[PDB]
Symmetry: D3
Subunit: 234 residues, 6 copies
């Protein structure tokens, strides 16, 4: 059994969703999955498995940061995960993005040391699996939810980025900041598995608090629904 996600042979399904927060994971399992069984709770890394419209689907908590997320991904791939789609939140880098908006990550700027350690310092363009990416973009369009497509930046120091630095990054195409995408995408190519990421803007860089819970929840629901319909596509 893996060191952190202590699950067994058949616990994890080929299709997995990766929320960073264990609380969102739980909500997804109860709200969208039939016959949900929690196969792991060690280290608060709640992971569940059930059926979504007849297809087996897993929901695994990654924790915050790429160091934490990388661990979960590597182990999920060992357990059998084939398609892993992250469903998280992000802080808008600019002002054209408003809380509640969705982001289909086309790529993730690697500002984290996890991808850096796996790459031994080499440059790199973390991008999701083209198919998964395409699937997320279609489903989002299909459902008709206000969404954006483009770059996000995966960082490590949540509290080190200043609004001014956020603006500087936006001039480079970064729509928002998060802390897991880059490593996921990198591992996707390294371990030969299909990955993707869709985010829900929960705040603007610099905000002392997140957007009103109502606004937030609605974006999360839409995001999860897109991700779920998308994972079935591939």
């Amino acid at each position: 059994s893996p060191i952190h996600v202590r699950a067994h042979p058949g616990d994890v399904a080929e299709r997995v969703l990766l929320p960073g927060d264990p609380g969102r994971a739980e909500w997804i399992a109860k709200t969208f999955l039939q016959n949900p069984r929690r196969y792991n709770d060690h280290r608060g890394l709640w992971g569940y498995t059930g059926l979504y419209k007849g297809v087996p689907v897993s929901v695994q908590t990654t924790g915050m940061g790429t160091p934490s997320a990388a661990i979960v991904v590597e182990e999920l791939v060992r357990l059998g995960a084939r398609v892993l789609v992250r469903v998280g939140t992000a802080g808008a880098a600019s002002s054209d993005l408003a809380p509640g908006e969705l982001i289909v990550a086309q790529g993730a700027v690697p500002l984290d040391g996890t991808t850096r350690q796996y790459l031994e310092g080499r440059p790199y363009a973390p991008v999701p699996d083209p198919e998964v990416f395409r699937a997320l973009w279609r489903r989002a369009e299909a459902l008709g939810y206000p969404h954006r497509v483009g770059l996000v930046a995966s960082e490590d120091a949540f509290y080190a980025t200043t609004p001014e630095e956020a603006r500087a990054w936006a001039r480079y195409g970064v729509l928002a900041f998060e802390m897991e995408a880059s490593a996921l995408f990198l591992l996707g190519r390294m371990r030969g598995v299909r990955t993707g990421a869709i985010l829900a803007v929960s705040n603007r860089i610099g905000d002392p608090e997140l957007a009103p819970p109502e606004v937030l929840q609605e974006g999360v629901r839409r995001m999860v629904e897109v991700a779920l319909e998308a994972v079935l596509e591939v």
Copy 2:
């Protein structure tokens, strides 16, 4: 008039194709465009403009390497370019990519110094414009032309990369090596224009020569058609 691409308002169309080789530019102009006209030949940067299915389309040579293409792109943008798609060739990094095969660039690892200078050393994930990327992908499918969608690595030193170094990059998802995409993608986001890149494999890194004209030529023809159909879509 710009310092390198000495063209005047009206010469360059909104839609532009960016081949690295000026000989191909000439060929594309005569072969696909009605009433082709060469608006620039300074420094060998042969740039044409004609109509493709009634729509204005320009074909501007970039030269080899990001330093060169950067110059061409920055200036084309000043002149009015809004949608720029590079149609070049690349060297297979892996063994599954067969010469002649097409690659729709989903992202470009930045191993060049041009992106490094524009970014001041900051990490980055060069990606094409989502819409353009999407259009290129779809058009390839609609035309029934086999294709690969993925990452390419933009490098500066053509003769530096060893097959062993290539296989290493292939393990990170790099399909092939070329020398212009990264800066195109970066400038795309920096200047607010939509870019893209479709490449025709012309060899497999390590090869003393390129591939047989005929096998590679049909690839080049398809690439251009896809690229032309795509720029009219967006």
Copy 3:
């Protein structure tokens, strides 16, 4: 109330133990603290406050990785944390360090990207607060529990480091690898709070699994006992 550790000023004591796993947090609260109360469970970041020999002591879960821990330390300081001692586990860099042995961290090689982001790429020597470091070393001696005093290395990629790379680092004095210390030490200096770190070796780098519960539990119990005794000393 902070964004991640949803608590208030009066919920956190001046002295805080920082385990990485919420499971140990809960275990410490119930096993060592009198009248322990959980002030947070958001994101699984389990936090407890109670009394130890009459002195208020908080036990906050940090999660895995400096990005997670940094978010948690920044917020604990905001909430009035003054003395923070990490009580975690680590992987031995050499064959001579056996599971269960204790390590009083004299410093932490910064291999993570979190410290890097805060330091804007500048070199640095992550070190504990001198008085806390000395307090941990003294209690360990006063209690008659064997221990090692030295350097540990804070990394981002759990599954990148191979046994050969770890032993190479051992030549430079690295006793073990873990994933939180460096940032804790850095933030200690940046935010002006006393911090320290004590670890219990739970495995040798490269081991498929961790050591058997009993062997490790006594080391963990000892570690926790030393930490609580040391925080009351400062």
Copy 4:
């Protein structure tokens, strides 16, 4: 037969001048060479061969940037080039260097990615061949043409450098900016050939346009004379 400069050993003389602009290459062949013959035009990399004062000399275009130049240089060496002297233009970094003034590159600061890739990140001091350097310096003195002997900077991003960044570099000895010297000098030492570079200042960093056609043209004329007189002396 090289992949880019499609010539064969024998088409290229041991003495070669390396202009960036292909039109300048043509001008030099028809102007100073007897029985000029173009041996390559592939990729617009115009190359000529003829006699200068009874000695065989080649004028090969390199294109803009160290990526393009490194390719041409690597192939010219294959074709058997022994002495290669760059004859280009440059943008003044200081305010004392006026358009039309000549520079005998004593060294070239490597700000490009080409040399970086070749050196694998290692620091380096790009310098010409001692003798070529001396011959150029001597010939410029003899012909009594006002010149400067010092450092130039080789960059990748033409439109990135600002007047302020240039003045800053001037304080370190950088006399002017260009885009090929560094790679030429590096490759010279690596492939066992003699290289050198003489430049004619055509503008000041930040200038929207080059200097008057007339003023610039004379400088180019002296530069070539100096270069031709020099390569014949080694």
Copy 5:
């Protein structure tokens, strides 16, 4: 016999004091030791050996800069040196340190190139041997001499660091700047010997001159006394 410190077997004692200035090495030997004997003077790297309270103690000059210190340390170790304590001067970074104050180095920020070359660019936390660190601290207290325990920064360019930068580093815990600590600490771990460092602030960064030889002198005597007591403890 070593290349620089031309001593013979047995000349060097197991415990060694390392002043950067030969003038100070001479003074220490003739002031605190019994039967001071000079075993080396080649390259001005004055080294003495005598008895401190019946124990053999050496005082080896290091010179300035980590490159010089590194040579001396390497050769001393190769000669049998076991305990090496640096006794030098430093430049205060903040106003929180006055001239004449003693600093017991807890660690040393590696801003130098020597540590960098030995580490091949890898991050690192240079610290003293724990016991030597502990001893230095313990003796300072037992002798009633005021002192500070914290970080110092080891740099290369003495005349480059500005007061503004120094204050910046202060925000990260840097108490003062010196030029040998980092390499000594690193070599201590690599070479398996016990090192440590105590410094006497002799000025503020930016000061045109060093503090009056009076206020400074008492600080230096205290520093040397503590270091002597210390090396005997280990």
Copy 6:
């Protein structure tokens, strides 16, 4: 009066030779200078001033390593030094350089941290003053001494470079390793003074000991002579 080289303006001549070894500075003074007087002995940095064929000439010790050398050079410039020429030894990186052979430094690969700190990490090509370099070159030929003209590499860790790395560097043009020239050349440009460097190969990289006293002493004498004759022409 400077902090390290405690001399008065009149003490230092416009022309200065900069040997690293204080013992050689003395030998130079007593062997080539008429009426030589020592103006400094503080920190072992022995400095002398006398007459060479009627012209005032100073001989100032630099110590080992760019850190120490930069200090000395900075202070000499502030004292009035106009022409500074290093006269030292170096370690051959290849087999075609025998001990006792002379090298006129055309440039110096900056492997040191001092130049790095002064440059704030920017790339660069340490080169001497054109005229000084020319004079050094011309004199060596005039006195008919066997010499090489090319690159050296200034390093920080004397004991880190392996015969293998030395050879790798040799393929890039490096003839020998030393520890001062790079910072000298950089400062020469920054402070507006004419610098130069000439070395006498005294060993091969990896040698336990230096060559026989006589083979090397003749090289040193020729080197010192060429430097003297040279500074008199600048």
